[PDB]
Amino acid sequence: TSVKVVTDKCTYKDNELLTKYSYENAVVTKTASGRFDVTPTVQDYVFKLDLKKPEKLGIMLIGLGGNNGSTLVASVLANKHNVEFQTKEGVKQPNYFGSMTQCSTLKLGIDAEGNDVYAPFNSLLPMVSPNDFVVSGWDINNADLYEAMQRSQVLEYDLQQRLKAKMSLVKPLPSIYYPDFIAANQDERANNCINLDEKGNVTTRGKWTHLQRIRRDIQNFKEENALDKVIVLWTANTERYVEVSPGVNDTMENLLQSIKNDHEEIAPSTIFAAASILEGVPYINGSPQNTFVPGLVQLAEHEGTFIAGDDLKSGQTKLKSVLAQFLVDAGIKPVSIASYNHLGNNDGYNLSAPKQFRSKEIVIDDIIASNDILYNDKLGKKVDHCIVIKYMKPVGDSKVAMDEYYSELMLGGHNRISIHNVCEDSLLATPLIIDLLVMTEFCTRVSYKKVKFENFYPVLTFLSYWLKAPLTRPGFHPVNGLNKQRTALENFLRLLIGLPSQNELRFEERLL
Amino acid sequence: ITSVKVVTDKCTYKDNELLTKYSYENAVVTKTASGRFDVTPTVQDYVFKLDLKKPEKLGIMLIGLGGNNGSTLVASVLANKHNVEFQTKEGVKQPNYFGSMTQCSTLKLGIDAEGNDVYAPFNSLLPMVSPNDFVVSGWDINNADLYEAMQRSQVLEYDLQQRLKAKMSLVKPLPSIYYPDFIAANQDERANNCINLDEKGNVTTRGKWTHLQRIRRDIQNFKEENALDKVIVLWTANTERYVEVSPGVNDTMENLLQSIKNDHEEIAPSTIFAAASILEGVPYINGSPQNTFVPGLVQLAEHEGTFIAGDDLKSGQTKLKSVLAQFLVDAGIKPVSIASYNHLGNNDGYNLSAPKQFRSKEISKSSVIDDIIASNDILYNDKLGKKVDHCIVIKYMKPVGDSKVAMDEYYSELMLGGHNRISIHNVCEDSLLATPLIIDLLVMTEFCTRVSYKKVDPVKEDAGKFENFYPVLTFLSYWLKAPLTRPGFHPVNGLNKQRTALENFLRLLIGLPSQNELRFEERLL
Amino acid sequence: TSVKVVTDKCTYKDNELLTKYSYENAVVTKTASGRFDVTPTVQDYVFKLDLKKPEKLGIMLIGLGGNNGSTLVASVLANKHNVEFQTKEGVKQPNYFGSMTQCSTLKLGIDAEGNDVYAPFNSLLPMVSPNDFVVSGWDINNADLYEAMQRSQVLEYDLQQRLKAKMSLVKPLPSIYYPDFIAANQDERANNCINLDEKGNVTTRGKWTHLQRIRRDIQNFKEENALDKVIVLWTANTERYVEVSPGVNDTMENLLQSIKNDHEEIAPSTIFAAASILEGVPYINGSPQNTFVPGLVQLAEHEGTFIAGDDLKSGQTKLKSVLAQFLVDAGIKPVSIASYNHLGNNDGYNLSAPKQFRSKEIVIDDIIASNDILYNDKLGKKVDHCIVIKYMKPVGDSKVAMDEYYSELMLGGHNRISIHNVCEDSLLATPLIIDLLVMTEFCTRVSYKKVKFENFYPVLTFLSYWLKAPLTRPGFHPVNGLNKQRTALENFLRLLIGLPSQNELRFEERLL
């Protein structure tokens, strides 16, 4: 399955694609009298896409032994080796359901009858398959991924047994454990640490040698498997936000300096990031903690390395943001929105401590911002909202989410909508992780020039669709509208092969 | 093993039998035309006799042995009896009988030396048969062995089915009676294990008396092949369509029996199994909503003096509904609407997908609230209205397997124009709930067959002689959706009251008064 | 409507009822081998019921201007004067729906066809009607009850307007305001206080003169309306628990002493209680705070005054306790139970502060205690449970409660039940308040003697049905089983008129 567009905007040379693209947009200024003055703008670009993709992509997950880590590895092996498994519904064939890059489609255009024609998401331009992922990584616990699977209780027992022989071979590398940064109850789980002093004890001293050991782990992984490309992704327990203070982590020199000075504002994630950046490998932060402090972002630009992150956009927040937008697009005013989530995994176990959850408890202000017709000082520009996460160990990885929306309708009416969501959290997070790795790898092969080619700006915004707290560029505010986060990705892929943005005008039908 | 020894002078033991005196109190009421209630207390002493020697093995014959419930029942018995632990994603699980009131619930025996309540197993008071001692068999219009049945049902954990594979593979259903018009047309291709075949081996609704005699011999054969003394038969097969009751047809014992002989078209397979069990003196329990117990049949039960009971297993949805509607009315709240929707993807919801099958169901799943309304004329009367909109919907959605999804919306009125909206959403493997319920019914039925009594004349020692429970075992209503009643008496669906009756019954047999919840040891100095 | 029982257990003399009652029960002792030895016990009693009930009952509500207070007053006037009102569903007739004493029935026995015969709950023995309630009380805010109704937004606007003329006449008396005891945000609401110093400022000094002013308010109310009987009920913002320390509030002398010593462990509720006790008027605590400290209980016994309380059993906790018990009675093991409630009234506004909510966040251990078959060390004698209350002002008094039960079924199965409850909290609390006042008044006319008559033991346990945290007697643990809390009341009324406890045996049907 492949796509071939006949357009003069695209030319190939040496397994390299050059595409011309005129980007339009507009600048608006609301005059005093409330009049909107709009001046269209246009910037011409040329994109270069290295068509040669890695035959094998290296993946190093921090928190490799967790729910997401073990499920990620199981999914790759299960599909790669077509491991069909037994269930009470009979034999099931492995697949990557839940993955946008592997299981969603896009509209390329219309056929001769005037009907939409769809194509696989990853069929327009070359993308690496999760089947060619080589996975390794770190974890403060040394259990092999088979034991990690058993511990997670995420996958069908029979599938676990069919992957037992292969998963047992995979074992996480020791990692960096700074106790003060996570939930204290994660203290006896840590039996796999590199940061130990002469008395064989865990220390936060020698942070630079810790950073150097991570770089070594990455180099070794690459060499040991003969891989050219590697991507690192954090999927470990949420850390407590670090304080961004001047002189400490505001510049890449201070940051690198603080790391050598064993500063207390340097968290483990801070070191895995600085270590990946220095090795030139893309780094994805899948947790809410503010790993990407200023200093770290500088070091990323300077090295021209791709970073991205801030939480693995839960499937509830994802969907909850969609409905909310749906209502406001319909002229309906949600005046209240209550969210209640409870899970029984370690993830929920680590969020128990308010320090870990406070990072998570961090989109509604954007929707309410989009509509001043319903939200203003005369009517009430406010929306009550609450986010409660509770740890109910008996529900395991199978989380339960509930959202209640109370909105006002016309003439005193009201509307109450309740969303009850139940599913194994990891079966939604894993595929998200796959999509992130696939698209990060894809973007590293893309360069642009306004009209010498520059890298596709380190902070990969197209990846906001899969991250609850979209990282941003100084000054610009993030946009969480999920449909728009996928519309961005979709149009980007389209513009790379000479196709315009979707307009949905269907003039072949609407007009004579 | 846990046991209970009540030091009372109301109980005496004689040759494997417990004799218990009990003074039953009640009161008759009349309401003066004007509006007063004249209440006359009543009393009637009894001496109950409980046969303590319970059967070492109890025969169980299920009609629908290869269905979701029959399948799971045998599996639960085998798994528990042999302690067949199994693997799941939550690890190794030990078998158990959760969901079984008889096996996993407790009863308060009293208070301790310090005033704190003391409970004991429901089955620890008096000798009851353990489901682990069930010797199960039965009939089914389909010949799949019970392992295939398990596979097809998709109720139990794959690993468990596998560990039960060898044993369950050897369990094969006896051929049954298939009368095409009594069930959904889709079960058509499923019937390949019938006894009613004509010269050229085709399905035939002719020779129904021969069929009755075959079923009876089946019961006899089963019994002797297992060296069993006791046997209970329980219908857990497809839901049949209601059969019309007509004078001279099935209105009397004699009429019914002849009709069976005449191959009357109002004689359903269940009618024959019911009649056969009754003639064999085997307790028969109807676990489906169809009106199997027509007058003539009940009459035959009464004449033969054989236990019958039933009409639909009290689903976890209709159970919880009775508990919640009762609760609201007991609190003075007025339900004015109760919407109950639900969908399943098993053969149960597939056979119910037909309007005539769903009809039986919709009759039993509804009536469960008629008595609730009748008890409160303060709320329900001619002024305020005494109606309660109640609709029941059962949709078939194959993709959900045995897992049923029940949703109930209660809209009630509160004071001064206010309203209350309660929504109950229920998800579970419907069959993991029904199975222990089937176990409860069989354990209690068996227990009852060992109970006899006699009225005691206060002014004349040892009058009369011991009798058995009136044939219709209303004591089993706790587990049935549409409680079968005695002519004249209305059914009571109050779940909590249904269990209380059972509780107090067991309590009295060991000389304990009914629970009063007065707790004067603390409420009074 | 009335009931007349023909029994020799009952004799009337001078509008006085004497009833004989043999109370049976049993003492159990589980021998080492796990054998239960049971010895039945029996105690004979004679109850005296003063058949002469007050023609008018005085009611003084602390927090008279709140949601419950104003709705209580509106309900009495609406029904008493048959104020029919307009709604979009048409004209509605006032009623006391939700009240057990006014709208529930009981089974007296069976008729001649063998069918149950029911009678009104308050038709067996004389009970005072809420229509003969004379209501007054205190509140830190001085708004009249008409303004209080508008503020509560609990009742149909049209009904509010039809009661406007009468409700405006009712105004709350100034009350005792000790800032440190409630949610700080209740600081500008307090414009009606008696505890003011010479500089006209609010003080916590002079607590004894405060107590004396309450007694005066009660005496005046009684005299001013020519009432013999009065009952006081607390329905004000939840207070923060006070610390029970020896020498301060462990005895009635220390307590009375501490009150004079302006001790910080003496809360406003503590004073309204001690003041009602001294005036010999029954005192009901409708909030979770521990008002009834030791000392206060002594003073109650010594004066032989009836007290009772500890939260107005929310309709959710009520029902949530019923389902939970239903499951455990069925042999089903709830292994997890999550509760999430959010409201927009002042009540929820006051619970915002963890100090107020902590009192509320205080039954599952009893159910789990009843069944060691499912709950033991081999299986797991634990049930995860959580209680979350959030303040969502837009939902107003119309609270939303959600309970999720996750239970284990046989052979690895599970059952998940979700209960979504929506209603105006006050429309459920008001009638509960009515039932409490009616039954407290009823019990004050009941005396007993084992076989000189003693008062129906101060701590009225029969009232646990309407109180989330049933107050108790030293040593005895409370029982919250709602059906059993109503079975107690029901049988008590029955035993007073010579009828035995319900057995549900129906031998007229089951036996030949």
Ligand SMILES: NC(=O)C1=CN([C@@H]2O[C@H](COP(=O)(O)OP(=O)(O)OC[C@H]3O[C@@H](n4cnc5c(N)ncnc54)[C@H](O)[C@@H]3O)[C@@H](O)[C@H]2O)C=CC1
């Ligand atoms: N649970 C889920 O399915 C989803 C999780 N997320 C996010 O992804 C993160 C991981 O979630 P899960 O895999 O489920 O949780 P988990 O708790 O099972 O896995 C985290 C793993 O991180 C390891 N770990 C902790 N600190 C470490 C360190 N300093 N170095 C290396 N390893 C370390 C732990 O030992 C554990 O095995 C969460 O913090 C959350 O932000 C978002 C959506 C869904």
Ligand SMILES: NC(=O)C1=CN([C@@H]2O[C@H](COP(=O)(O)OP(=O)(O)OC[C@H]3O[C@@H](n4cnc5c(N)ncnc54)[C@H](O)[C@@H]3O)[C@@H](O)[C@H]2O)C=CC1
């Ligand atoms: N499955 C559940 O959770 C509950 C079931 N029930 C009732 O219990 C009954 C059985 O339910 P399931 O086991 O789930 O259904 P099922 O459809 O899986 O099993 C019924 C079995 O009966 C057999 N059968 C049908 N007509 C027969 C006849 N004349 N003679 C012998 N066998 C016959 C069928 O071939 C099938 O194997 C139904 O009537 C249903 O309404 C009620 C409450 C819950």
Ligand SMILES: NC(=O)C1=CN([C@@H]2O[C@H](COP(=O)(O)OP(=O)(O)OC[C@H]3O[C@@H](n4cnc5c(N)ncnc54)[C@H](O)[C@@H]3O)[C@@H](O)[C@H]2O)C=CC1
């Ligand atoms: N909101 C409801 O409908 C129900 C309330 N409850 C309970 O009843 C209590 C009252 O609830 P609502 O009437 O709804 O709340 P509310 O906040 O509307 O009414 C409480 C009233 O107490 C007054 N107040 C506070 N401290 C006082 C003091 N020291 N002296 C005199 N007045 C004082 C306040 O000014 C307010 O008017 C709650 O604390 C809660 O424990 C329980 C179930 C339902």
